[PDB]
């Protein structure tokens, strides 16, 4: 619950030396994948990266990628969302696109595979729609017409009935997919678009916004909890990743920031290393102090919180 006193720094344990828009671990934290403007989904072996730097899979795409989400049951399956609006499910062993969902009419910023109903995935787009898909069906299962651009959609980790939707309207819309006529709750507090939403647990939701804050919310009792400050994020998608205790995000200062969920100012930060670069993607290795990070130059680092 309170391990932050153990840590003062992030150590670099590996570096792979354009923009990486997304970096994500597979179901077992064995492989990770990167994707971005270069139209190539690259899969790396985490253990090889730490011990040694060539990807073990490279899948070319039709469009720049905005987001990746690995399937939580089918080890080899990974979804992507791209700038043409296409949501694709890939098999990293065969390299084939298994599904190409094409209903979005503008760039899709986000895709997320459900942890608990692993054939379900959700996407959000500049077309102001949230779409829920099932890997066994070609047509969307659920469509939510919203009023503003959707930057991020994330399933609750304990139930596929709930999604958090981060909107350009500055709010987080929390839906029960069993009745989409109204969200369960809409969380106001951010002053700019909500670029990411991520759950620490079934009841704890975090968000990032281009108001240079992260925020923590209680989705059991629909309460604001805490606002986190220190990083610079006024313009770009700079990444958000959370686990049971920690939030990490990028910064337009080319720094990674780590917050403990109980403390509003950073536990630590790391300068990536003249130029205006930004951190563009982050991903914890589950509840451990290890994290993947990447920036707008395409550099990837494996970092670990340390004393």
């Amino acid at each position: 619950a309170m391990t932050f006193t153990r840590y003062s720094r992030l150590r670099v344990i590996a570096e792979i030396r354009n923009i990486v828009s997304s970096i994500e671990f597979d179901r077992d934290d064995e492989l990770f994948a990167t994707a971005g403007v270069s139209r190539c989904i690259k899969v790396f072996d985490f253990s090889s990266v730490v011990n040694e730097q060539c990807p073990i899979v490279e899948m070319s795409t039709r469009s720049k990628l905005s987001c990746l989400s690995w399937n939580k049951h089918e080890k080899n399956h990974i979804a992507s969302s791209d700038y043409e609006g296409i949501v694709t499910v890939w098999d990293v062993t065969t390299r084939q696109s298994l599904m190409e969902y094409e209903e979005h009419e503008k760039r899709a910023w986000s895709v997320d595979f459900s942890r608990t109903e692993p054939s379900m995935l959700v996407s959000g787009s500049d077309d102001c729609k949230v779409k829920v898909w099932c890997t066994r069906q070609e047509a969307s299962v659920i469509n939510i017409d919203m009023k503003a651009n959707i930057c991020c959609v994330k399933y609750n980790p304990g139930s596929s009935n709930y999604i958090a939707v981060g909107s350009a309207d500055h709010h987080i819309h929390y839906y029960d997919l069993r009745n989409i006529s109204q969200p369960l709750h809409v969380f106001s507090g951010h002053k700019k678009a909500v670029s990411y939403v991520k759950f620490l647990s079934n009841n704890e939701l975090a968000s990032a916004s281009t108001d240079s804050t992260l925020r923590l919310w209680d989705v059991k009792d629909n309460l604001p909890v805490r606002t986190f400050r220190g990083h610079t994020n006024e313009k770009n998608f700079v990444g958000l990743t959370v686990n049971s205790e920690y939030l990490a995000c990028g910064s337009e200062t080319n720094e990674v920031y780590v917050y403990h969920k109980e403390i509003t100012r950073p536990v630590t930060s790391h300068r990536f290393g003249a130029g205006s670069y930004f951190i563009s993607a982050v991903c914890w290795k589950s509840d451990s102090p290890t994290m993947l990070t990447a920036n707008s130059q395409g550099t990837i680092k494996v970092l670990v919180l340390a004393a």
């Binding site: 923009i19 828009s21 403007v37 720049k64 700038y83 500049d126 009023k147 503003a148 651009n149 930057c151 909107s167 350009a168 309207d169 700019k192 678009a193 670029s195 281009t210 313009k235 770009n236 998608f237 930004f278 563009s280 707008s296």
Partner: peptide
Amino acid sequence: EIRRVPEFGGY
């Protein structure tokens, strides 16, 4: 610019 977050200010 490609990773700029959208801004919305309509109805």
